[PDB]
Amino acid sequence: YSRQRGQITAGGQLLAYSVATDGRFRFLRVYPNPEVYAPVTGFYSLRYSSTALERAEDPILNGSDRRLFGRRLADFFTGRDPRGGNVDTTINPRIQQAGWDAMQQGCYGPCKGAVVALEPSTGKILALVSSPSYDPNLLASHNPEVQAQAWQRLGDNPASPLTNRAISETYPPGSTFKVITTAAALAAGATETEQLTAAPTIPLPGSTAQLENYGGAPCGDEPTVSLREAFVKSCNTAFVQLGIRTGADALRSMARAFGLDSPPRPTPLQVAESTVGPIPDSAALGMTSIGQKDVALTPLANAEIAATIANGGITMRPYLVGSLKGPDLANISTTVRYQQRRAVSPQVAAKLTELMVGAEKVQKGAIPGVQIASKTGTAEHGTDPRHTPPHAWYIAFAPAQAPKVAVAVLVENGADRLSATGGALAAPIGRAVIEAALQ
């Protein structure tokens, strides 16, 4: 705290910086747009240490990195004031700000949840939004009592604003998971035109439970509907039937192909592992097929599914740090994009894209001359899922035919009772984020 810690930047703008002060500890850490970028910067605290990129890039920021130690040694010798190096993130401030703003206004008041934006061709993390958030300036206070009181307030806050919901928490994906169920069926040789039940309810095999379509209505006015029709209408019973037909092994395999049940690589922030669950029986499989039972995904993992489809079936390794520089801004490291895995063939990726273009069309915040591929849904949660307001999800990419951005929006307890899927509140948040990305 004696030496000038380096900066965390986005789009040429400062997210975190240190100012020389009269403190016993001379350098005070400052977060000029603190709640918005907290999930990216984290905090750097005298009594509570560091989190997020302050922690992950500590050796660069504090100047103790081996790659930098030639410069700090030169500084001591010469007499010149030392400086830590800089961390240049992949975040686009316009996109981050739009996601944040949309989350703050999107639930007739502020929304709890997360927004993630990814660049599908590279894996750049363009936004990482969590809500509610907190002010890292509080924990950067040099007053022990100011820090301790903030710490206690945040710890006791039942909305847990310290949590980075985008990467650290998993949620049932609900209806968005029909993307995976569909992908698994398509790879196993199902076609978009094949006929599935339009029934308003479907018994789950080997149990007394039944699953019903959202709103309790039949999928259409015919005995059956095409897989394509069921997807765009997001009819539950058709996907229960389809998933059970496709089988637990195939669903597990497709989930894995899309990054579930694999420990995520650091971004350099650690990401919670997403899972399809063990799928112990066919009742469970039924529920898994519409993203319930034990299926649990981070918002980043759901953005990644959308980004993978957007990028022709190839998953790019997501990353948050584009480059590291010295105090004098000379290059230390530049992140190179990496093809992590092919999840799905280009043909399946295209079929899923077409299905998702159809679902989007089935419109608050639509963008003139921009075709969006999306999936909106709800997700039951907790120990009383039938009564608790479900989550609202939107996953999407655009322009659908040559994508530049993929998004996931999770609005906790944001589910609808009137809209076509019941996830409508999440949709215009996603579109505002896409609009910001494409401006």
Curated annotation (Swiss-Prot):
Subcellular location: Cell inner membrane
Reactions it catalyzes: Preferential cleavage: (Ac)2-L-Lys-D-Ala-|-D-Ala. Also transpeptidation of peptidyl-alanyl moieties that are N-acyl substituents of D-alanine
GO annotation terms (biological process): cell wall organization; peptidoglycan biosynthetic process; regulation of cell shape
Its EC number(s): 3.4.16.4
All ranges on the Periplasmic side of the membrane: 1-439
InterPro entries in the cross-refs: Bact_Transpept/Beta-Lactamase (IPR050515), Beta-lactam/transpept-like (IPR012338), PBPA_dimer (IPR054120), PCN-bd_Tpept (IPR001460)
GO annotations of cellular component type: plasma membrane
EC primary class: hydrolase
Function: Transpeptidase that catalyzes cross-linking of the peptidoglycan cell wall. Required for the regulation of cell length.
Protein's recorded name: Peptidoglycan D,D-transpeptidase PbpA
Gene source species: Mycobacterium tuberculosis (strain CDC 1551 / Oshkosh)
